Symmetry: C2
Subunit: 239 residues, 2 copies
């Protein structure tokens, strides 16, 4: 395969859809997650079992390099969250969310960049949220909101630093998507109704619809597109 | 051809590159401009001679419908500007810039929407600028800045209104691109140097690089992407 890609959180939800879209583009893909074997076998990707809440990120990148024979694309779609308001949230919980979403994003990108630079072409795709621009509405998710907003700053910073190395860095911000990660949200009218009423398209996205844009940001289409957030939200933020 | 597209300002610069990219996607394209015949013949599109600074916009849309047998995509890339500071600018000049960039955007979209709605699928692509987010730096372009920023509001408004009609509306914001429209800017060190120093990628874009993203926003990739600005600027805004 052409481009070599590593997708964390690639066995479920959005990550899985992105991995599938990249395989469809002819990329050699490695899927990292706690239990990536089923997804890897089904999608035709390389499985890299890992617990990114504990395992050294650069170690995962090394494994990806060894498994793929190079590294051009990094998509950090790993998911996790502690849905509690700030007054209830413990520092440990705050750190758990910020570590996986933000610190690991930095560590993975830092480790992957030299390989992309050597190849003279790279794409880093961080995953944001509508909470990169708002506070989540009826849902108490301060840590998640902070982390997903922080990613926009990291995106701009790395895009600036690595622009001359052939690397493009962007933040894909999906809106409300039908996935297991959002399963608890959709199964409650008091929350689903008010949120959906603000989506002009009147429906939540299918993971594959989000992946179409992720693929663009991981390809030649993004040659002159870097340091930006791209929201794919059915019109939610515009409402 | 599949999708039917109308591209204004499609015989030169960014518009021409977008028209070419759409033809490459298998779309039946109509190019509108003062003298679109050479471009239409070269690219394999339908020429629609028109002076959008004077001719009724809905009349152009009608001609496009007749020439293409339908209408799914509208790209308003027509260009014009009066580079004078606010204290020097006359109301007539202010209106000239706002009319072509903004009023005509509204009139063209308003006329095209019913046809897209009937087809159950549509894409409206307005063209912004880095001045949709800033004031142009060393260049005195208040009218242009105002118009290109206004387009973001129009984009959100129309995206919201037409979401359930199958229409997606977005604003492609190109950075500094090598075109004849920007020819006077590039031929002056005192202006080119300070601007380029703020582009992380260290170079201006080729029209075709911008068109790659325009094509995405005029295709199925943008199914769940609406009411947004997408900046393709080599990292300029992020710097």
């Amino acid at each position: 395969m052409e481009r070599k890609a590593l997708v964390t959180g690639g066995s479920r939800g959005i990550g899985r859809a992105i991995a599938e879209a990249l395989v469809a583009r002819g990329y050699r893909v490695a899927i990292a997650s706690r239990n990536p074997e089923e997804a890897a076998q089904s999608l035709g990707a390389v499985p890299l079992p890992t617990d990114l809440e504990k395992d050294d990120p650069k170690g995962l990148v090394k494994r990806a390099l060894e498994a793929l024979g190079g590294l051009h694309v990094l998509v950090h779609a790993a998911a996790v969250n502690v849905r509690k308001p700030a007054l209830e949230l413990s520092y440990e919980e705050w750190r758990r969310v910020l570590y996986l979403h933000l610190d690991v994003a930095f560590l993975l990108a830092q480790a992957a960049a030299p390989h992309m630079a050597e190849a003279g072409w790279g794409r880093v795709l961080f995953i944001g949220s509508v909470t990169t621009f708002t506070a989540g509405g009826p849902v108490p998710i301060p840590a998640y909101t902070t982390a997903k907003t922080a990613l926009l700053g990291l995106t701009r910073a790395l895009a600036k630093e690595w622009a001359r190395l052939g690397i493009r860095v962007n933040l894909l911000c999906p809106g409300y998507v039908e996935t297991e990660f959002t399963l608890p949200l959709r199964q409650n009218p008091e929350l689903y109704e008010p949120i959906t009423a603000r989506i002009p398209m009147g429906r939540w996205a299918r993971p594959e619809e989000i992946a179409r844009v992720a693929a663009v940001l991981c390809g030649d289409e993004a040659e002159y597109l870097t340091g930006q957030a791209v929201a794919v939200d059915g019109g939610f933020l515009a409402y």
